Design a protein around this ligand. Structure first.
Ligand SMILES: NC(=O)c1cccc(Nc2nccc(Nc3c(Cl)ccc4c3OCO4)n2)c1
Ligand SMILES: [Mg+2]
Ligand SMILES: [Mg+2]
Ligand SMILES: [Mg+2]
Length: 274
């Protein structure tokens, strides 16, 4: 949806993206109430290929409609700067939000966040969309702590193209996807297990200071991240299930959501910790 630039007011720069600023603003279109939006801008100096890559995120987001997937409002392409407008997520990225609030949300709250992410992923997998960069930094959080998946793009990773979309995010990536570049919803399930660990650790870095090659070798040699402090064993076991070497043995997203719903209904089960 092309948005008339007169309908947009930019209020404040709140972040930096790959191609430009991220801003908070207001969108007011005839016949509709004013709403808060996030705005990504692309200013001058870009190639047309870069413009297409920037806008491809809008095209992809616009294919989706789900309460746990970032909603596209529209784009501005007939003037400069070029913009993508979405719903505004007041609390920003989950990893940083959790680090700010370390130890300050309950296990049930954390499970609800994880449930929202899992529902978003359930939807994407149903749509045959493989995310490929599922990480807490790509989850956005609103004022009511609802978590939504962000970061959409279909460009191959650098390792998939010419000998001579960025690099594969090794710490989040399933071993077969690193080895063979076969990205599937089952490799996203591996990534989702890593997100679980990030959330239950209030935004710690997966594998601490281990090098990328150290991580690859460790996983091949059966190492898996340990339960975060105070993490319910049932949640850690779901992580381990997501991290099965055999992709076909990992839970699919409907099963992940089911498991989390059961936990929420049976909160006593979350009391067992190592
Ligand atoms: N660290 C931050 O940038 C930040 C800080 C505080 C709040 C938000 N909030 C926030 N809310 C919604 C979206 C985004 N970022 C974003 C994304 Cl991820 C994809 C596409 C797009 C965006 O804005 C419009 O077009 N951000 C983002
Ligand atoms: Mg991506
Ligand atoms: Mg990415
Ligand atoms: Mg800690």
């Amino acid at each position: 949806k092309e948005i008339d630039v007169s309908y947009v007011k930019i209020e404040e720069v709140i972040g930096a993206g790959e191609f430009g600023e991220v801003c908070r603003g207001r969108l007011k279109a005839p016949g509709k109430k004013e709403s808060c939006v996030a705005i990504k801008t692309l200013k001058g100096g870009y190639t047309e290929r870069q413009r297409r890559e920037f806008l491809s995120e809008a095209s992809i987001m616009g294919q989706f409609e789900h309460p746990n997937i970032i909603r596209l409002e529209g784009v501005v392409t007939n003037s400069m700067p070029v913009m993508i407008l979405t719903e505004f997520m007041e609390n920003g990225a989950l990893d940083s939000f959790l680090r700010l609030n370390d130890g300050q949300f309950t296990v049930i709250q954390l499970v609800g966040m994880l449930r929202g992410i899992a529902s978003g992923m359930r939807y994407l997998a149903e749509m045959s969309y493989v995310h490929r960069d599922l990480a807490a930094r790509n989850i956005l959080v609103n004022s009511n702590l609802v978590c939504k998946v962000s970061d959409f793009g279909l460009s191959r990773f650098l390792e998939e193209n010419s000998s001579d979309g960025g690099k594969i995010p090794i710490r989040w990536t399933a071993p077969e996807a690193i080895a063979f570049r076969k990205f599937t919803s089952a490799s996203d399930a591996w990534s989702y297990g890593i997100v679980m660990w990030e959330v239950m650790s209030f935004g710690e870095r997966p594998y601490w200071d281990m090098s990328n090659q150290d991580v690859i070798n460790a996983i091949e040699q059966d190492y898996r991240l340990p339960p975060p402090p105070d993490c319910p064993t049932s949640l850690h076991q779901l992580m381990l299930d997501c991290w099965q070497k055999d992709r076909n043995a990992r839970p699919r997203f409907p099963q992940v959501v089911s498991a989390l719903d059961k936990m929420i209904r049976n909160p006593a089960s979350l009391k067992i910790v190592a």
